[PDB]
């Protein structure tokens, strides 16, 4: 699912550059010819403001975490036999180790 | 099951379960050593900051599993990519405590206690040392000690 | 709501942070790709800045007592540096364009 | 001719030699490069001693 | 729209400059923690360190304790008679945040590099008071203010980027053994001053202006209840298989 989020905000992106390509094609038409003080169209702008909401929408949920405010939900599932052992004192002297001495 | 659990797998999942495992710091040595190895072998190309790690808790397991090949094997590439290291010195007093002449591994933590003043991991393991070797009374009183 | 935990608040802070910079960041690349007078720049940014809330509004919907304890910093959050690094991307691309 | 006003705004400026704006811009790359590595190492070495 | 201008400069002013302040950035962040070092720690200042974040959790934490461990706890911290606090006793350029003068520097050499030049226009209204401000090597009195320099470019750069930065950087938590480490000399890091005396004789008297309240007491709010969610838990804990 992610990477078809990342994907579709590549394509918006790369839609607004285009976009963005075709208003500079636009603007350097207009430079030519004097007067004719007009907007660029409302076809490529309704296609940029397209690619703005599309990237807009990945954007979110790329990075989604919202992890739980309650801690005592994540130490809600783990057992007290797991917690008994401690990496730090750690006697090397069991059965399973003279019955795994042979092989 | 086993070349049946091999075929359907990732690293990627693998150093996954491995790192959960570390986090909740469970006793499956069987199976931690089951694991190291085979990433060790198969991939060993990348993540060499996890990989050292991934080193270091082989060893912890195969210290306890069977096998002190293995150990050795990463304490050698432990030792050429750090040189002086007190976590290696520790693994390997540990190691050193595990086979025989548990004195030995003693002053080489009384070393590490002259080198470095504040190691808790040294006196922790000193402490277990003689939890094991003699009464139990001496030793709750050195972690009383410690713990003041 | 007895025991919070601080490590949960900062990454949801982190999280609403980084999507707030990210849109703000865009919404100034849309607004300097079409070229408007600062009153109407201001208004679209903050239309943006709504319609983003409103989306992260959204996201949470059910159980969202969990997620957040109030909605002021949803809401309000992340106005003047936003603003801040998107009046950066609005001119960047509008000179580029037009001046150039 | 031609004659100017107020000396140039419009025009680059003929003096801008690029060997030292490449060379720093270049030089940058390099040193943070070079302090990824040093900073990635350093963090490791405190985490391990 | 007007002063039209070469497209030559843009790619030789603008790309350049952008590039250069987000790498001087970068090296200044790398650099920044490449020089931090570490600070010596005597084993004391740990030990009181921890006395007064158990004094802390204490206060915090002390609701749900038995009332007779709390007073032994207390007493133990007070001892009129002889007392641990009392007693044990210790004996005794403008550098600020330099952030602002490697920019300062920075922007100098690029104005000073680029005399004459026009960079890019602002499309806010600005005022004519702010004139000398932005041009800066310009001499026109009919332009407009929206035409900046360099210099208020890198300027308004610095700060375009600053919660860029954060955005590729973050926070690390790692290294459960040396978290512990971590936390003592953060800790220590903190109580380096030395005020020992007063230290402990304001904490000897807030520990005393704390009351005791125990949150056991309220234990009917429970037992009337209902308890579903204990199998709304335990369906969704069947499905899982044992590898």
Redesign the interface.
């Known amino acids: 699912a992610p990477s078809l989020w990342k994907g579709l905000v590549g394509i918006g992106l790369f839609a607004l550059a285009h976009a963005a390509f075709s208003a500079a094609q636009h603007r350097s038409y207009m430079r030519l010819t004097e007067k004719e003080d007009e907007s660029l169209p409302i076809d490529i702008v309704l296609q940029t403001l397209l690619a703005f909401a599309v990237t807009c929408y990945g954007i979110v949920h790329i990075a989604g975490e919202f992890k739980d405010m309650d801690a005592t939900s994540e130490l809600k599932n783990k057992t007290f036999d797991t917690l008994r052992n401690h990496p730090s004192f750690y006697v090397f002297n069991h059965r399973g180790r003279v019955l795994f001495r042979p092989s | 099951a086993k070349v049946s659990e091999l075929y359907d797998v990732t690293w990627e999942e693998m150093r996954d379960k491995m790192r959960k495992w570390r986090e909740e710091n469970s006793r499956n040595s069987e199976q931690i050593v089951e694991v190291g190895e085979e990433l060790i072998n198969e991939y060993a190309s990348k993540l060499g900051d996890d990989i050292w790690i991934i080193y270091e808790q082989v060893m912890i397991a195969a210290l306890d599993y069977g096998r002190d090949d293995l150990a050795l094997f990463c304490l050698q590439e432990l030792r050429r990519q750090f040189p002086g290291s007190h976590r290696v010195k520790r693994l390997t007093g540990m190691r050193f405590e595990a086979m025989e002449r548990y004195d030995d591994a003693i002053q080489l933590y009384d070393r590490i206690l002259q080198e470095d003043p504040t190691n808790t991991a040294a006196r922790k393991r000193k402490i277990a040392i003689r939890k094991a070797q003699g009464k139990n009374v001496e030793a709750i009183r050195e972690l009383n000690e410690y713990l003041e | 709501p007895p025991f919070i935990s601080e490590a949960a608040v900062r990454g949801n802070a982190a999280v609403l942070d980084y999507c707030r910079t990210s849109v703000s960041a865009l919404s100034g690349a849309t607004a300097g790709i079409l070229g408007l007078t600062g009153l109407y720049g201001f208004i679209f940014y903050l239309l943006a800045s709504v319609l983003l809330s409103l989306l992260l509004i959204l996201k949470a919907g059910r159980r969202w007592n969990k997620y957040f304890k109030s909605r002021r910093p949803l809401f309000t959050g992340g106005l003047i540096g936003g603003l801040f690094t998107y009046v950066l991307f609005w001119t960047f691309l509008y000179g580029m364009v037009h001046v150039y | 001719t031609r004659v100017y006003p107020?000396?140039?705004?419009?025009?680059?400026?003929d003096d801008?030699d690029?060997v030292l704006?490449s060379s720093?811009?270049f030089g940058?790359?390099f040193?943070?490069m070079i302090?990824?590595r040093?900073?990635q190492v350093?963090?490791?070495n405190?985490?391990?001693? | 729209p007007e002063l039209l201008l070469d497209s030559n400069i843009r790619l030789w002013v603008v790309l350049p400059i952008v590039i250069i302040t987000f790498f001087v950035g970068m090296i200044r962040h790398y650099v920044s923690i490449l020089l931090q070092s570490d600070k010596k720690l005597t084993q004391e200042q740990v030990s009181d360190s921890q006395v007064l974040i158990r004094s802390r959790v204490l206060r915090e934490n002390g609701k749900y304790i038995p009332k007779q461990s709390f007073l032994t706890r207390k007493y133990y911290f007070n001892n009129p008679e002889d007392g641990f606090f009392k007693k044990t006793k210790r004996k005794v350029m403008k550098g600020n945040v330099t952030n602002v003068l490697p920019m300062i520097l920075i922007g100098g050499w690029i104005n000073m590099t680029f005399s004459g030049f026009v960079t890019t226009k602002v499309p806010f209204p600005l005022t004519l008071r702010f004139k000398p401000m932005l041009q800066q090597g310009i001499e026109l009195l009919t332009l407009d203010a929206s035409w900046v320099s360099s210099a208020s470019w890198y300027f308004l750069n610095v700060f375009g980027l600053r919660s860029i930065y954060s955005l590729i950087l973050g926070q690390d938590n790692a290294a459960d053994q040396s978290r512990m480490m971590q936390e003592q000399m953060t800790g220590a890091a903190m109580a380096m001053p030395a005020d020992t005396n007063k230290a402990f004789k304001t904490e000897w008297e807030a520990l005393e202006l704390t009351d005791h309240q125990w949150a056991l007491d309220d234990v009917e709010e429970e037992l009337m209840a209902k308890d579903l969610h204990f199998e709304g838990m335990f369906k969704k804990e069947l499905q899982t298989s044992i590898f």
């Open positions: 107020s000396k140039q705004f419009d025009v680059l400026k801008y690029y704006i720093v811009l940058l790359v040193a943070t302090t990824k040093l900073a350093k963090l490791l405190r985490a391990w001693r």
